[PDB]
């Protein structure tokens, strides 16, 4: 725990890899019972 | 004996809404679980997996099914109109009337501010409404 493990992680997944990132909220938590 | 009477009365109470359910008493979890099967589904879901009206009706039926095992000559109760909203409240009052007007061993005094005479289910005999003239 001495080196920047976030700055490299910030360069990745943002500058390169063009990877979509989504929160994906806990929607199935509130599932309607459809009575 | 008490749990058997409560279970049977709860089963007979749920038939008013065309439901079919049961009570389960668990000592491992020290909890009472209500299972209700309504018209739409084919599996008895947990009572918490329902709507507000169904849960309120189940709670009222549980109240009656808890009064049942203890044979009481006289039973008295205060208002319940604030715990049930619109149509469910009418159905709950109907359940109270239907389940309590039949039994002769138990005399019930229900004190409510809501006018029962507005409910169409007043023509049934054995129900006494004493509306206070003085407000």
């Amino acid at each position: 725990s001495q080196f920047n493990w976030f700055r490299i992680g910030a360069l990745y997944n943002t500058i390169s890899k063009n990877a979509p990132i989504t929160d994906h909220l806990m929607g199935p938590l509130s599932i309607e019972k459809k009575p | 004996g008490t749990c058997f009477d409560a279970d049977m009365d709860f089963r007979a109470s749920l038939k008013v809404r065309k439901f079919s359910g049961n009570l389960s008493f668990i000592k491992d979890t020290k909890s009472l679980e209500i299972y209700i099967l309504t018209t739409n589904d084919e599996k008895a879901r947990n009572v918490d997996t329902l709507s507000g009206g169904e849960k309120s009706f189940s709670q009222m039926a549980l109240l009656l099914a808890t009064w049942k095992p203890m044979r009481s000559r006289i039973i008295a109760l205060d208002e319940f109109d604030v715990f049930m909203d619109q149509v469910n409240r009418k159905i709950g009052t109907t359940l109270i009337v239907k389940k309590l007007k039949d039994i002769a061993r138990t005399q019930t005094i229900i004190i409510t501010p809501q006018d029962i005479g507005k409910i169409a289910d007043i023509d049934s005999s054995g129900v006494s409404i004493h509306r206070m003239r003085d407000p």
Binding site: I21, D23, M26, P28, S30, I31, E32 | -
Partner: protein, 322 residues
């Protein structure tokens, strides 16, 4: 899809990458850095039109999401004015360049000293047939439901003493009170609200052990769903109430603020003892008459300073909600 579409996509991706909720100043800075490479340099501009050029793009994304099945809600945080705007020396953009909050200003000098509303990416679908899980199983869902229930139950306090825990909210409340009028005698009432408070009760879960509870709670805190105060009490953040707008109103009987419809989580709530009627079970303003911090500031500085709930003196008001 040359310039405007790329900027809209970048703004939406930045909103999503921040786990839905993101600060509005960060969005403004991102829009500035996207527009400075879009059409010339845009050096001669004003923030009064920058906010509109952000809002119109936000609405353009929002209508597309709505026709797709999503929405971005500009829900205002419970804490407002400069208390939430300060953050850590405003926006971040020393032997080395590692801690420079006031440096790297956009263009010559651009700064937003006021910011209260947060943009949150939410899903309007209720049943959600398509999605059944994200990264968790049913045990974690049950633990989350139990934590939500405990947070809802803890809202009501019996008496409370003059502990006067002063970390964030009560300082802003006192500032608003002294701005309205200078009393400094009995503004700090001995009534407290614990709407978002739990330390040991969450640890009493049966299915999951203490280590699993700690790991799940830490993961949720890192995901910005449950936040901790300075004392160390867990509670629901703005993200949870922004997403579950219907879960906290249908299953649980809650009231809205002075606005048309909004979820109140913190602010001022006294209610004295005669609540509106008696409600299902809990009382003390459990049916209506709740305010935010910014809403309280707006109401107290305008006409009808006294509470409209059948009359309430300011002496008994000032209840702190944590």
């Amino acid at each position: 899809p040359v310039t405007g579409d790329a900027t809209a996509k970048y703004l939406l991706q930045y909103i999503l990458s921040a786990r839905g909720i993101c600060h509005e100043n960060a969005l403004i800075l991102a829009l500035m850095r996207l527009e400075t490479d879009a059409s010339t340099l845009n050096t001669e501009w004003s923030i009064q039109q920058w906010v509109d050029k952000l809002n119109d793009y936000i609405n353009a994304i929002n209508v597309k999401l709505n026709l797709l099945g999503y929405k971005i809600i500009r829900i205002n945080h419970g804490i407002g004015r400069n208390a939430v705007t300060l953050k850590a020396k405003q926006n971040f953009e020393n032997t080395a360049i590692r801690a420079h909050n006031n440096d790297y200003a956009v263009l010559q000098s651009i700064v937003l000293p006021e910011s209260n509303r947060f943009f949150v990416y939410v899903n309007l679908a209720s049943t959600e047939e398509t999605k059944l899980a994200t990264r968790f199983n049913q045990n974690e869902i049950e633990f989350m439901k139990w934590a939500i229930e405990q947070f809802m139950i803890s809202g009501e306090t019996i008496v409370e003493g003059p502990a006067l825990e002063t970390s964030i909210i009560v300082k802003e409340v006192n500032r608003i009170l002294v701005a309205a009028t200078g009393d400094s005698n009995l503004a700090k009432w001995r009534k407290f609200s614990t709407f978002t408070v739990g330390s040991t009760n969450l640890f009493q879960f049966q299915e999951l052990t203490a280590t699993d509870i700690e790991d799940l709670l830490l993961r949720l805190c890192e995901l910005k769903w449950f936040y901790r105060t300075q004392e160390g009490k867990f509670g629901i953040d703005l993200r949870c109430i922004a997403e579950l707008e219907e879960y906290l109103t249908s299953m649980y009987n809650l009231n809205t603020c002075q606005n048309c419809h909004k979820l109140a989580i913190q602010g001022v709530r006294c209610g004295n003892e005669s609540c509106r009627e008696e409600n299902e079970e809990t009382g003390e303003n459990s049916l209506s008459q709740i305010w935010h911090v910014d809403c309280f500031k707006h109401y107290i500085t305008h006409v009808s300073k006294n509470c409209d709930r059948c009359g309430s003196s300011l002496i008994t008001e000032g209840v702190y909600v944590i």
